[PDB]
Structures are given as structure tokens and as C-alpha cells.
């Protein structure tokens, strides 16, 4: 009568990590276990009717670890399914960045990106993206005029852009977080568009 869990997938953004599965249960409950690949299993979500489990508190302890998960099925030898392997540092989606400020400095514009807070905690400090990634983190800018003749591109190792602009022209700005050294999930989603005179 019990159905084993399937399509086990990690949903992770800025280290906020949720495991998800199928199916939506009928007369059954689930227990989720998590372990580091070498270490021991630990149960987190107990006899739940939910098809998801928040595992952030476990993964924030060591973000440079490979994690495994399994979901057991019980009615309301036990049936189970293993998840794909998950290494948070390499695989977590970079969240939506925000343009902090844009200022007109002479014949140039300075655009600054917010140093986005994550859920990773060291004592009484909630780590920013720069804190976690360091040199690995890079930002890309898209900038265009009122009459869009193709979107131009800029890159920075820091959180600041210095771009050559034309006088009187109102520009619109969009920013993106990039970890070039990743296999997967290298680029974040686009920042909200910030325009000169808005």
C-alpha cells in the first residue's frame, strides 16, 4: 500500500536548502535522513505529510561537504530512496542581486552591487556572498540607452563598475552574480532594472 519516494531533488538558493520529492502522500508519512558521505545518518523531518524538508541548519555547518539524503515511507523492511549528491558551495544557486547605488562621476558612472547576506553563520556574523566565495565571485553588468542599439557588457572582480557614458543620455542598469569556476549554476538571475531618472 506504501509508495516509495521518487524524483528526489535539492532546491538551494544562497545556502537555503530544501529537499523535495514525489508523491503527494495518501495514507502514508515520510522521514528524511541526511549524512555527510563518510559520516553517519541523521533524521531531520519526522513522520511528515509534507513533500519537502528544510535542511539549511545541517548544510550551513559545512558548506564544502558532499551531502546525501534518503526518504523513508511509512503507513499512517521499510521502503526508501536515495537522493543525488549535493555539495552546497559548488551547486547552490546565487540569489537575485540588487544594485545598491548608481552615481554620475564626471563622464563616467559608478554602479555598486549590494553585498548580499546568506544564511551561513560564524559566531554572531551572518556571512555575505563575498565572505563565502572571495575571489571566486564576479559581477557582470548590462547597460543600455533609451534607444536600445544592443546591450553593452562590463565585468568586475569587486562590487563596483566604472563605465564610460555619453552626456545627457539616460541609462538603464542590470547586474548579475557569476562564479566562473563552477560546472553548474554559474550565473544568478538578473537584478531589478535601475534607470537614471527613476
Amino acid at each position: 500500500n506504501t509508495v516509495a519516494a521518487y524524483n528526489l531533488t535539492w532546491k538551494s538558493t544562497n545556502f537555503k536548502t530544501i529537499l523535495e520529492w514525489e508523491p503527494k502522500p495518501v495514507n502514508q508519512v515520510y522521514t528524511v535522513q541526511i549524512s555527510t558521505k563518510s559520516g553517519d545518518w541523521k533524521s531531520k523531518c519526522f513522520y511528515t505529510t509534507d513533500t519537502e524538508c528544510d535542511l539549511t541548519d545541517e548544510i550551513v555547518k559545512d558548506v564544502k561537504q558532499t551531502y546525501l539524503a534518503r526518504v523513508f515511507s511509512y503507513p499512517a523492511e521499510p521502503l526508501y530512496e536515495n537522493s543525488p549528491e549535493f555539495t552546497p558551495y559548488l551547486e547552490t544557486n546565487l540569489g537575485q542581486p540588487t544594485i545598491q547605488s548608481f552615481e554620475q562621476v564626471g563622464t563616467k558612472v559608478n554602479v555598486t552591487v549590494e553585498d548580499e547576506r546568506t544564511l551561513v553563520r560564524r559566531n554572531n556574523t551572518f556571512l555575505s556572498l563575498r565572505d563565502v566565495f572571495g575571489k571566486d565571485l564576479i559581477y557582470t553588468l548590462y547597460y543600455w540607452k533609451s534607444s536600445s542599439s544592443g546591450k553593452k557588457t562590463a565585468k568586475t572582480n569587486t562590487n563596483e563598475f566604472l563605465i564610460d557614458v555619453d552626456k545627457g543620455e539616460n541609462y538603464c542598469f542590470s547586474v548579475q552574480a557569476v562564479i566562473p569556476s563552477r560546472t553548474v549554476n554559474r550565473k544568478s538571475t538578473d537584478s531589478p532594472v535601475e534607470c537614471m531618472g527613476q
Partner: antibody
Amino acid sequence: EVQLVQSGAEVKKPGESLRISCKGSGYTFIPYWIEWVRQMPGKGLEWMGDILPGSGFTTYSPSFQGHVTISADKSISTAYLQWSSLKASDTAMYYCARSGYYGNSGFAYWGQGTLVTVSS
Amino acid sequence: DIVMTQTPLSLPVTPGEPASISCKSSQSLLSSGNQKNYLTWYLQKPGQSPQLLIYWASTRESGVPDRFSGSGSGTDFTLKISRVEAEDVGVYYCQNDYTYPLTFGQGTKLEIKR
């Protein structure tokens, strides 16, 4: 504990190819950068380059680009440094190092070193 | 390339008294977003591999005694040892840990004065 084990000492003629290795254990191999550092007899430290074993992505120092290749085999937790043809001035100690846990937190763990002798 | 300059080149210290090594960078090592100075200190003892001592200019790696301390901002940085013993001898290196390519100083030899 975290251990970096490098391959044994090498004695080579000029113009010969060489590959030296650095095996990592006691940690998850893929999300940590492996660094290569040259130290010539009685001299300072020179950063040669690095590799992220999870992808194979490499950065090189402008001084070392084209002279060396850095690679990794993540299934056996091993990184590599190799030459096409060695010069006599390649006679040095070579260290592999692993990066720290937090961003830009230095090279936290070092291997014992590989002495490379290039002579006629 | 960010050039790292160390003064002095050699430092004789009597047992029990303080030691001060200075590192200067040609470019700023301060990151504006998180207000962190990306300087790293190392110790290489005779016949040994380098050891990590301090990162983020002033944060100690676990295992490193509290007698080691870093300070400074932007371009000027300092490593202080409060009470020098025999096992503290060797060459001290600062490192640009801010931007590629990664660069080391020449090194400061610390020896016991007698």
C-alpha cells in the same frame, strides 16, 4: 585530519617531461582549490597557479603560463603539475596547498614538498 | 601584479620580548562591500613546509597561539608577536589574497638574539 601527500623526489635531464602529484585526504576534494607553489634553493615563495577539482578550472601566474599544466583527477582525490620540457632553472622545491574554508582565507594545508632536480 | 614589500628583511629578537614585522602592498587590499582586508600571513620553519598563521589581516587560524596578532588596513599591515620563543624562528611571508595573480613578499627571517 587533513593530509596532503606529494609524490617522491625527481631527478631529470633537461628537455624531459615530468608530472608530479598531490593526493588529498581527510576532506571533500571537489570544492577546495589546490595551489602550486615554487621555492627555489634559498629563495622565497612563488605562486604558480591553482585548480578547482570539481570542474577542472585553472588559473595561472603570468610567469608560469605556457611552461606548466595543472590538472586533477577528482575520482582519486589527486591534483597534478606537469612540464613538457624541463629547464635547469626548474630545479626547486614544489609545494601543493589547499585553500581555507571561508573566502580568501589563505592556504590552510600544505604538503611535505617535492624536490625536483634538473641537471645534465 | 600587486607587489608585497616586507621590512625588515632580517629580525633578531631576544627571547621573551616583542617582535614587529611590516608588510606593504602596492595596491589596496580592502574590499568595500564586507570591509575586509585580504592579507594572509605565513610562517616557514627551517626544513618545514609553510604554515598558515593569520588571514583577513587579523583573524587567527585555529591552533595558532594568541601571542600572534595582525593589524593594518588598505596598503599598510603589521604582524606582532608578543613573546618570542625558540620555536618561532623561520621566515615570515605576507600574501595578497585579494586578487589574481597571488603574490608573496620576499620574507622576513626571524632569529634569536644572543
